[PDB]
Amino acid sequence: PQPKVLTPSRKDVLVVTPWLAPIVWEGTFNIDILNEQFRLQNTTIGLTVFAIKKYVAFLKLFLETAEKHFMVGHRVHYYVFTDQPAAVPRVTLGTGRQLSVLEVMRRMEMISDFSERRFLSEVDYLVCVDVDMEFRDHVGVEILTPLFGTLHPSFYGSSREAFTYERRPQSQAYIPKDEGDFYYMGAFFGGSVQEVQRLTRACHQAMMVDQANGIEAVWHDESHLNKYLLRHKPTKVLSPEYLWDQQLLGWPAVLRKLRFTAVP
Amino acid sequence: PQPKVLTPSRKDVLVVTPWLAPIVWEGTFNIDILNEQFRLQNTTIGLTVFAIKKYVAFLKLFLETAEKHFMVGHRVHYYVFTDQPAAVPRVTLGTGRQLSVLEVMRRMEMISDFSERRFLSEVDYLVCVDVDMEFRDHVGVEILTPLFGTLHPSFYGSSREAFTYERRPQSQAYIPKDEGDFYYMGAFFGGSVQEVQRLTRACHQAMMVDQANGIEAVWHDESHLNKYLLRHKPTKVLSPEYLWDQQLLGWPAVLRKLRFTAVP
Ligand SMILES: O=c1ccn([C@@H]2O[C@H](COP(=O)(O)OP(=O)(O)O)[C@@H](O)[C@H]2O)c(=O)[nH]1
Ligand SMILES: O=c1ccn([C@@H]2O[C@H](COP(=O)(O)OP(=O)(O)O)[C@@H](O)[C@H]2O)c(=O)[nH]1
């Protein structure tokens, strides 16, 4: 179809940030056009996931649903970080899709180390998510951009003084009470390999300083992620369609699709 | 202020294309944030303008108004292409701003040649406009992106079969009747130096082929510009606030600012 300049793509939600980064909601994008632009570059997407201790139990559904909904038609490489390589279930993968097992403050440190490895040279973007989740609907190249965060589903409706940023000024994650654009969740972020290198390195180095000063930020790496994305603004922001909990929050009308949701 | 996820930045216009490029309207951007991000990189903007024959008469107002409204606070280098160097008026410039005179199918060919010169090595973005115009209001770094076009003020409300694309299939500028996103005007386009190299080279090479085949596209380089931007989609699109004619079109309510307008 033809975009119509005089008709809003959505009349109920903000679809662009004040720094002109798209906020990704159903009805904002034509997936056919995006798929073509990304296929033209033979894009490869790395997906990182941690499954430590009892969390290995979530991988089977996480992977099977990824195969149905995540970047289908594109090249995908899953990187599973685990303390149990033998517990990784053997999930059949579509063509162009691969999985590697990496045996293991941790997430940022580890992604930062892995992100700098030469075997990542084929990969174009990295997407970093929680494992206690399942895909229910399309998650595709509409998310891909140099740097993106995701709105925490519990705060997208909130004002900034209510955001659980780190408020102690001795913490590297410190954000003053009248500062802040959005509250991003540490459960889904990513960007090009270079931007994810920069982000995870910055968060890891900041946390190290906090540790050397006897402070642990209130929400741990998520606090440092919010500090980083305040100072280095994401080039796309994912709407809560991309990170949801239907048991705790239902299915409000503003969410036309629930794409990637908590497992009960 | 704080962006509010549940409140549209505009309820009367489309603010993002179906490929997630921002469409730049007043109320979509916080200029303070954009100015800071661009100052952090010490951005230099080149502005190209042609003033041939009687058109040299428009430079004095074009330049004086540019100095009031165009990229103020950033580094700017005007490139005036003229058959009359002595007719270039001597306009006083703000700090960080410079002007060069270049003595002269033409616009694309010439920008393409100039855009590949090494003396452009300081410049980060190129903006290419008509000279029979004046700035009335802010035109700033909100436009800057790898590739942008501007909606032709006469067609932003139209359907695509009404767009004056080149319709003969022997022309390189050929666009089929059920294809097309927008009709862009050849009076205001730009992007990073590299994307403007690519665009002007493509349009110039396409026109050369049309000439070698005894065809002139209906709207000349604007036809080839539309063909190029159909196949290589702009990363921002400027709303008609950025290219207007108040004598012919008035001041409709959807235009909250008239930034860059035709001289009567
Ligand atoms: O014992 C654990 C605790 C956490 N995690 C990983 O760290 C993420 C964050 O924990 P939860 O998912 O427990 O955190 P929120 O994402 O903080 O609910 C999980 O998704 C897993 O990917 C893990 O693998 N094993
Ligand atoms: O004799 C001419 C004709 C055109 N132009 C340049 O080419 C642009 C396009 O012409 P007009 O402005 O006459 O074209 P539209 O932009 O086609 O009205 C002008 O803005 C000038 O920048 C010029 O300098 N001298």
**Nearest C-alpha to atom 6 of ligand 1 is from which residue?**
A50
By the 8 A CB rule, do B193 and B116 touch? no
Q: After what residue numbers is chain B broken, C–N > 2.5 angstroms?
A: 104
Here the tokens at position A24 are 């990704």
Regarding beta strands A188-192 and A125-129, do their DSSP bridges make them parallel or antiparallel, or are they unpaired? antiparallel
Among B83, B101, B129, B132, say which to mutate for ligand 2: greatest number of ligand atoms within 8 Å of CB.
B132
Residues A9, B5: C-beta atoms closer than 8 Å? no
> Which of the 8 DSSP states describes residue A172?
T
Pure H helices in chain B: 31-40, 59-69, 106-115, 193-212, 221-231, 246-249
Is B20 close to A236, i.e. CB distance below 8 A?
yes
Distance CA B154, CA B237 (A): 16
The residue ranges of DSSP E strands in B116-187, in sequence order, are 125-129, 133-135, 147-150
CB atoms B28 and A18 under 8 Å: yes
Measured at the alpha carbon of residue B175, what is the angle toward residues B174 and B177, in degrees to the nearest 5?
130
Q: Which tokens hold the place of A214?
A: 């006897």
In this structure, the number of other CB atoms found within 10 A of the CB of residue A169 comes to: 8
8 A C-beta contact, residue B244 and residue B262: yes
Q: Could you tell me the resolution of this structure in angstroms?
A: 1.9
For residue B226 the two structure tokens come to 């539309």
Q: How far is B146 from chain A (nearest CA, A)?
A: 13
CATH 3.30.70.141 holds for B1-264: no
Q: Is B131 annotated as a binding residue?
A: yes
- Structural contact between residues A27 and A9, judged by C-beta atoms closer than 8 angstroms: yes
The conformation of residue A240, written as its DSSP 8-state character, comes to G
**Vertex B228: Cα angle to B226 and B233 (nearest 5):** 95
Helix (H) or strand (E) holding A39: helix A31-40
Pairing of β B23-24 and β B236-238: parallel
Closest CA to ligand 1's atom 2:
A52
Local structure of A230: helix, strand or coil: helix
- Break chain B down into helix, strand, coil percent, rounded to 5: 35, 20, 45
Select from B98, B3, B234, B83 the least CA-distant residue to A239. B3
* Unique residue bearing structure tokens 């889904």: A188
Q: CA A4, A9, A11 angle in degrees (round to 5)? A: 125
Provide CB contacts within 8 A for A232, sequence distance 6+: A147, A198, A199
CB contact under 8 A, B18 and A30: yes
Distance CA A257, CA A181 (A): 24
Q: Is B28 on the interface with A (CB under 8 A)?
A: yes
CA A125 to each of CA A102, A122, A147, A228, A250: distance values in angstroms, whole numbers, following the listed order: 18, 10, 9, 19, 31
Coil/strand/helix, residue A175: coil
Around Cβ A90, how many Cβ atoms within 10 Å?
8
- Mapping DSSP to helix (H, G, I), strand (E, B) and coil, where does residue A75 land? strand
A52 is in an annotated binding site: yes
Q: Look at residue A219 and give its three-state secondary structure.
A: coil
Which residue out of A131, A133, A183 has the highest number of ligand 1 atoms within 8 Å of its CB and is therefore the one to mutate? A131
Distance between CA atoms of B109 and B112, rounded to whole angstroms? 5
Pocket lining: A106 vs ligand 1, CB cutoff 6 Å? no
CA B226 to chain centre: 13
**How many angstroms separate the CA atoms of A130 and A150, rounded?**
12
- Of the candidates A106, A108, A105, A59, the one whose C-alpha atom is nearest the C-alpha of residue A85 is A59
Strand boundaries in B83-124, DSSP class E: 97-103
Q: Are A129 and A260 in contact (CB under 8 A)?
A: yes
- DSSP letter for B21, please: P
- CA A211 to chain B, closest CA, distance in angstroms equals 30
Do residues B213 and B123 make contact, with C-beta atoms less than 8 angstroms apart? no
